[PDB]
Design a protein around this ligand. Structure first.
Ligand SMILES: Nc1ncnc2c1ncn2[C@@H]1O[C@H](COP(=O)(O)O)[C@@H](O)[C@H]1O
Ligand SMILES: Nc1ncnc2c1ncn2[C@@H]1O[C@H](COP(=O)(O)O)[C@@H](O)[C@H]1O
Ligand SMILES: Nc1ncnc2c1ncn2[C@@H]1O[C@H](COP(=O)(O)O)[C@@H](O)[C@H]1O
Ligand SMILES: Nc1ncnc2c1ncn2[C@@H]1O[C@H](COP(=O)(O)O)[C@@H](O)[C@H]1O
Ligand SMILES: Nc1ncnc2c1ncn2[C@@H]1O[C@H](COP(=O)(O)O)[C@@H](O)[C@H]1O
Ligand SMILES: Nc1ncnc2c1ncn2[C@@H]1O[C@H](COP(=O)(O)O)[C@@H](O)[C@H]1O
Ligand SMILES: Nc1ncnc2c1ncn2[C@@H]1O[C@H](COP(=O)(O)O)[C@@H](O)[C@H]1O
Ligand SMILES: Nc1ncnc2c1ncn2[C@@H]1O[C@H](COP(=O)(O)O)[C@@H](O)[C@H]1O
Ligand SMILES: Nc1ncnc2c1ncn2[C@@H]1O[C@H](COP(=O)(O)O)[C@@H](O)[C@H]1O
Ligand SMILES: Nc1ncnc2c1ncn2[C@@H]1O[C@H](COP(=O)(O)O)[C@@H](O)[C@H]1O
Ligand SMILES: [Cl-]
Ligand SMILES: [Cl-]
Ligand SMILES: [Cl-]
Ligand SMILES: [Cl-]
Ligand SMILES: [Cl-]
Ligand SMILES: [Cl-]
Ligand SMILES: [Cl-]
Ligand SMILES: [Cl-]
Ligand SMILES: [Cl-]
Ligand SMILES: [Cl-]
Lengths: 355, 355, 355, 355, 355
């Protein structure tokens, strides 16, 4: 519901000489806040007791807004402190969750870097799949029901398993049921897709509305538990175990792609951006990630995407091999965001980057 | 056939005040061209439509030479543009392939960084094995025929499989045949070697003919599809699949070796360089890679080598842990190459580095 | 036995205008010595023939003290050269081993960065376990005997295997016996613990006695042979092999943790430091590492620790994502150590950092 | 009157996680505020309409406190805003004047970098002369009355002229009287001293109470109007003019001293600092300037001093030849001040640097 | 008398892994020693009590060799310490004076950066004038005797005055005699030359024997006492004084030349270098200064030169406008010298730079 004009008029009461960058202390905020300082900004960190130490010891925040629980960040009281500080908020995974995506879309009256509307399109698998399919991107083959399974599939519930047949599907669902991990309602909405066998590249892009350009900033591969620990056990020993794989994100590892695949990499970002302009105007604004798998035919297949900054940007907080090429600098995504905020304030084009 | 004097006399007609660095837009050209700019050079990128975006958006090339297909880079027309631009060409994997190694050796009349003759020694498994064996380096044990198999082996055809017996060899060859991946002629020339079980270090060295020194620049491990995706599937599920491993390079991951192994690391490069001087004068010039596996006895076994810059240098385009030690700089291999070109022009010793 | 006053009075005869940093040429000495140079120090490297090349080519040492074998570094002759050079010695894994931990504790009369006494607490599994348990840290569940095994365990002998039952334990012990890898005396003291299935984070901390603060410097995951090569073999092929896993450290790979887990990360270091002050005064001084595994419940379980600089700091010799946040610099652990030595000399507080 | 305990207890109610650096927008505030940002601080600038542009366009201040006139900076309202911002104030020439030195000494209840008491000793020519004389420094010879004049003298009134005799003194005083530049009361308190003929070095020092050390940061020579414009007129033309010299500071020019004179330079700062400890405890804190003239006998004679930061530090806001030697950095005095504030907060020694 | 082979054979007994840079603590040693550290060298400073503080507080020397008086630096004892430290000595104005130029030429058996023989050519006005005249450089017109004076001249004695006639010459000589500044023997050897009226540029060049190139590093103007203080007194007041000008170097001020005059600037260095090769082989090595005055016809007239590093390089110890152009670095002359020492050691060409 929140209007653009409604947000531009909040920002107009802002002291344009004292624009700060704010965010929630979690997810990717260390380089969001570091990147801001490096660009000249004073920074605001929403934090809480027991969770504030990393931001205090890394010296990355100038002002703290302590909440009782991160859930309070929807409260109109915190919105006020943020407006009085002239903060532009940089959204990220954790902020959207603790604030709630409905509160974000029509109850959070603080200026926000990026296209506010499009945060819904990453939250819903149908919108996400619609976008990736319509943008012309390779995605895993989808399966309507367990009876349609004719290969190895992975099965996700909004807590994960692999199946190579209809029969294996139910045996495994049953296991995860009689172990108190999945209720009958989760499996009633099981999402089944082709298991893509390949190398993980989570590709971090930045779309600049100022330059009208998609940029490559970096790449990581996920480090997930228990799976990346499960597959480190020798095959003979794994068979002696009664252990199911889980896919809980615990961290990230840096990777570079084969250089001949960069034309495919940019075309993917270009296409995604050209379609999102049509479907959710103005489209992708700033940081976005295609989480893909590269098969043996050197084709990147995208199984996920983010419409804002992705946790994997943490793997290059001191810059990376791709962020370096632009200007020989240790450039993070956080700093690339802050720079866009800076240039837009200087060119009087803040309307291209906030909502 | 191309003579050294034949190349020195092409370079003598060069305007020594305007020496550019050229390369093909692929493989490792992003840091070759970035590294050149950082050293003061103007840069030339051979590119083509649909494949030029990465070089335009990374702002790494000053002049583009567009070809219809990269195969045209042998054409005497492109050789002329390069000579008129006073370009020294930096060779790499992709350039040699698209240009053709015979065209490189006697039909490509543009000055080239490195020892031109020695590019043949990396192309032929017999020359390569000859060199590594004569340099005194550990290599996988070789097997003349499937009947000689007495352990786990890996089998390569100039598309890969593992066997632990003669019987398994044929069963697998048959599979890859009746699946249209290998013709009877490929398996007629199957290369069988010991499967080395260990940690991958692709070690990137630079030999300076100016300093008469082998330098350590960095290290990566390969990220290959489908294999690195295959082994991420739990053992129980893998057994339910009918899937063969492939070993297609898709990218790279940074790694550092145990420091006590660096004396072995340098001795390997020293030895390789001392033997290549004898076998293919003047020997190794500039960048070279030993692709090795470290067994549990802390011995590096080399299964491959490159006689020019290797794709893994991309993992440290913003510098790495070893390239940093020299001068505290974000030094890439591309920039280390450009620096040698610079120093040689300044010391009037271009004859030590081109051919 | 070596007293603090005994060491302060050695250091008092030091020319305070010419303080050098010394260490043994191995383990982590490349960034210890590089970091020192960067902070203004002249550096001393204990090295030997055949093992000195890495330090000569990286140009990281100003003065060499050549020994016949690294075992000689206990010799009172080498202690004298070090005292005459005004060297503070930075201890590390290799130095303690070659010098011998008893010689370190009462026969090595050279000033040393860190708490000398506490190097014993990392050497003994009982002290180490005592400390981690009393500090309140999660550790693997321990097993008194093979008959207590009720899950997957890993078994270590001061050369490793996994067991999922009492029966499997003996079958495997027998195998490693009848293969000449373990004598009956090793298995008589077998250390059996819970096999933690998860993602490896070796977390590198620095405790500053000057700032009274625990800092996060970086993180790596181990790269071990043959295990990380064993699990890269497809499950079907592994079953055709008669191969046991080994866990020999060969190198390291960079990783970042999920940012929401940093509060747990710092609390772990804080707790460890607060307990070590009580148990071994003054406690942890400078660099320390918690080597942990993150399970699917996002809990870090510590299976090992170091009470000095850990080999994994090599993964960020050119700085890392966390070391960057402080001041936007390529900061290594080696340089963080040297800086503390520098600040302490400038503030006349060398008594807070040496022993 | 303002007590130290009275100031420590104001600072104790400060949020130690959000310490800002404040100052008045004038004099030397550009590098005071720039230097602060570079050290990680958020900055507060006291400014006013018509005088705020330089600080807005140089992007050097995060928060502005607008006053009606700089005279309002004594007002208890502005003191409150400063306390609520957790600001340490950095004093300078302009701040003391607009605030009034009595208000500074007992009516300005905001923490302040430096020794508050000693700002009186630079304001009074008797205290200043007492200090320089007792510290053992060369100063111009003083003259009790016009009748004591036996050489070339310069005559100052708290607007300047040169005399070489008693007679010339009165003729000139009369001129400046019958021209409405000096009243009979100014000349009733005329300060007459030896005219020192030599080269101007305004030497900028920093005393660190943390390191107990006097540091050399830089040097400038004054650029004064109309005098430096008067002496640029050829002698023949000057004689055709009826023009008196004035000595109004308009700017500064960088200079380096002859290196053999640096031992004299440091001894002067050392001596000044050792005497000020006795006379006005704790003595000199942070930045101080000896404004001297070097005669042909290579002796520096001091005609003025500042007990805080001097305007000449502006000549090296991007660092200078001496500030560079420490760490190869573009270090300004402003940044050297901010660093001391930083280190003191980190070492819990804020009591050594504020009052 | 000292031979080159005699010096090469001293240097051959040097540990080539531990080459240090040494110099006397005075003149230009701050950037000589800083520049060395920046290039990776350990540094040796010859100093003495009462004169060592600047080098201790600037942290620029790793090892001190204390002498009783700087005159002792000729002593064979100090030569030994320097040889045992593997020091290459960098000569400068003060070192040559305290050591004595005869001792330098045949009694100082330590390797020395530059052409040892040519230090005599800067010491003798006849050799100096011979060189500048034969190199084809503009110099002041010379006058054989006071009776030849037909314009404004300046008169120098190996303490200075200006004369516009024969009569004025004697009146002034008489004054300086009856004031005890000049004996009858000084004026018996008075050197009289054209007074050049113009702007002072002391131009600092570096000749690289490695690159065979003359480089422009920077420029300063002298700051001399009492003269630059004398001319700051208004003309009317100067006439009321009985004061003679002196020209004692006290410091330096940075200046840049008009860019259209750089072709003249380089040709002057080129010419000087081409003639010095013939007259004193191998010629100019490393740093040299032409001290010139630019007349209204935009012609640089050289009144002095140095055959080693000149004191004016101190004006750009943090780099300057010209030293910046090469690589965008804060490059001093001291660091440019150290770099040449570094490159020569790396290229095995130390024979091009020492003697
Ligand atoms: N289509 C797929 N094929 C193979 N692995 C997948 C697929 N989708 C997800 N995964 C793995 O499951 C993890 C969690 O996926 P998601 O919850 O979709 O982000 C991913 O990071 C992948 O490692
Ligand atoms: N390092 C990371 N890599 C990838 N995804 C992440 C990372 N950190 C957080 N996320 C995602 O963002 C969500 C919120 O993060 P958290 O607050 O850490 O639970 C998680 O559910 C993850 O899907
Ligand atoms: N001797 C070997 N033992 C084990 N793995 C190998 C061996 N040779 C090659 N490989 C794997 O196969 C991939 C392709 O090898 P190549 O085609 O020889 O460069 C390598 O990157 C290795 O990961
Ligand atoms: N990132 C890389 N790592 C290792 N080898 C590579 C890499 N990129 C390319 N290569 C090798 O160079 C050849 C040509 O590269 P491409 O043009 O990308 O196919 C390939 O066949 C690979 O063997
Ligand atoms: N409790 C455990 N659970 C699983 N793996 C372990 C455990 N302890 C050690 N390891 C693995 O064995 C290697 C050697 O362990 P350690 O010798 O205890 O340092 C470690 O780096 C781990 O990869
Ligand atoms: N890169 C590394 N990562 C982790 N641990 C290491 C590393 N290097 C050495 N160590 C440990 O330090 C000990 C001595 O090292 P080394 O002298 O290399 O054998 C080894 O036994 C290892 O446990
Ligand atoms: N004793 C002196 N001899 C010569 N010039 C002076 C003397 N004192 C002050 N001046 C000049 O007058 C200017 C103003 O001096 P003051 O007002 O004392 O700071 C100084 O910057 C000097 O250039
Ligand atoms: N650039 C400068 N150099 C030397 N002294 C200065 C400078 N700027 C200001 N001052 C002194 O500080 C006082 C206050 O400065 P202002 O507010 O600029 O008048 C002046 O009376 C000067 O004596
Ligand atoms: N020919 C000349 N004409 C005018 N001024 C000169 C001349 N030679 C020397 N001077 C001045 O006298 C100072 C001392 O000169 P010198 O002792 O020759 O280095 C120089 O720095 C000049 O400022
Ligand atoms: N800063 C400087 N500028 C020009 N010449 C200098 C400088 N410092 C020293 N010299 C010359 O070098 C000689 C020795 O310097 P000193 O030991 O400082 O007397 C002096 O006689 C000067 O001629
Ligand atoms: Cl992203
Ligand atoms: Cl995310
Ligand atoms: Cl390479
Ligand atoms: Cl390659
Ligand atoms: Cl550590
Ligand atoms: Cl270790
Ligand atoms: Cl000052
Ligand atoms: Cl001032
Ligand atoms: Cl010079
Ligand atoms: Cl000089």
């Amino acid at each position: 519901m929140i209007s653009k004009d409604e947000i531009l008029e909040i920002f107009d009461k802002y002291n344009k000489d004292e624009i700060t960058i704010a965010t929630l202390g979690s997810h990717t905020s260390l380089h969001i806040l570091k990147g801001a300082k490096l660009e000249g900004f004073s920074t605001v960190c929403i934090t809480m007791k027991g969770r504030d130490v990393p931001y205090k010891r890394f010296k990355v925040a100038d002002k703290f807004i302590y909440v009782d629980n991160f859930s309070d960040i929807k409260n109109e009281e915190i919105q006020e402190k943020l407006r009085e500080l002239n903060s532009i908020v940089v959204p990220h995974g954790s902020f959207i969750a603790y604030c709630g995506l409905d509160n974000v879309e029509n109850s959070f009256l603080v200026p926000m870097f990026g296209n506010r509307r499009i945060l819904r399109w990453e939250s819903e698998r149908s919108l996400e799949g619609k976008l990736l399919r319509e943008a012309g991107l390779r995605v895993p083959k989808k399966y309507e029901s367990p009876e349609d399974i004719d290969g190895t599939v992975i099965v996700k519930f909004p807590g994960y398993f692999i199946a190579s047949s209809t029969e294996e599907f139910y045996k495994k669902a049953e296991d995860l049921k009689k172990r108190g991990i999945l209720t009958d309602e989760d499996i009633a909405n099981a999402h089944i897709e082709e298991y893509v066998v390949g190398t993980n590249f989570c590709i971090h892009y930045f779309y600049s509305p100022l330059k009208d350009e998609v940029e490559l900033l970096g790449m990581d591969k996920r480090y997930e538990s228990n799976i990346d620990g499960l597959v480190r056990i020798p095959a003979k020993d794994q068979l002696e175990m009664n252990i199911n794989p889980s896919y809980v994100i615990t961290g990230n590892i840096p990777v570079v792609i084969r250089e001949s695949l960069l034309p495919q990499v940019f075309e993917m970002g270009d296409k995604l951006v050209a379609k999102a302009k049509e479907l959710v105007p103005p489209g992708m604004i700033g940081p976005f990630c295609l989480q893909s798998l590269c098969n043996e035919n050197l084709e990147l297949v995208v199984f996920e995407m983010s419409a804002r900054v992705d946790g994997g940007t943490n793997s290059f907080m001191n810059g990376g091999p791709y962020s370096f090429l632009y200007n020989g600098e240790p450039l993070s995504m956080g700093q690339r965001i802050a720079r866009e905020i800076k240039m837009a304030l200087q060119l009087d084009m803040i309307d291209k980057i906030i909502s």
